[PDB]
């Protein structure tokens, strides 16, 4: 029994709303709202809590971090990050929460920091090879991957991907994606890393590609039903869910899921209370 | 400062 949790986002401005999808009831619910309006935050499930990391409050990029206890339905502040980070990616690897890249209000970041829940402290780890704002991240096979994004040095949306090894504290480029994707959704399903949508300038992608670490190669799968950048992504019960996002002009309220056995994308019949982009998405135990 | 994400700033 899982619940999909969707936190904040732009609809069209930063909001506090936190919605949960109950797969058994097949209904959405509003749960405890974020203490402050947020979009473009990282989102992870760790130690039974949902961590909302950084983001944008409509005015400033922030270094705040809050954790949500699904049982108590309560948000609590945790230690601020070292750096302001908005449009970062966040992931858990070996019990540490990583905040990867993003934008601090000035420039995109190659820096990365990690959070130790035992000490409630953040510390920098090795930076990425490239600055990446609007970066997606995923963990598979004990490695952390930073996928696409935007590099202000070259003013390019990125087709490159790099992988972090926590044992050596090193980032290394892996195989390049087929196309540039800033704002790609990233998920992991059946030992494959998915890069979902994104954009290259005003060109928003409906294409999706998958990466196999054992072969270090990418290939494309079925297109989504619609173009999406800044969509949230999670894996549930053998399917990959893609939540909201925008098509470059409008924020989307729809969710669609991918079935890797049928190579088909299906739009979920029940949409969120409103179209939202840049929302944090994760899955928790019910 | 611009409210848009960095990738969207011009």
Author numbering:
A (entry chain A): 306 to 591
B (entry chain C): 557 to 566
Quoted from the paper:
KLHL2 shares 84% sequence identity with KLHL3 across the Kelch domain, and 86% identity overall. We determined the high-resolution crystal structures of the Kelch domains of human KLHL3 and KLHL2 in separate complexes with the 11-residue WNK4 degron motif.
Two Kelch domains were found in the asymmetric unit of each structure. The KLHL2 and KLHL3 structures were determined at pH 7.5 and pH 4.3 respectively, which probably contributes to differences in the resolution of particular residues. WNK4 Gln567 was disordered in both structures, consistent with a lack of stabilizing side-chain contacts, yet was critical for peptide binding. Consistent with this, we found that the WNK1/4 degron motif bound to the Kelch domain of KLHL2 with similar affinity to KLHL3. Our data further support the recent finding that KLHL2 may also function as a second CUL3 adaptor for the WNK kinases.
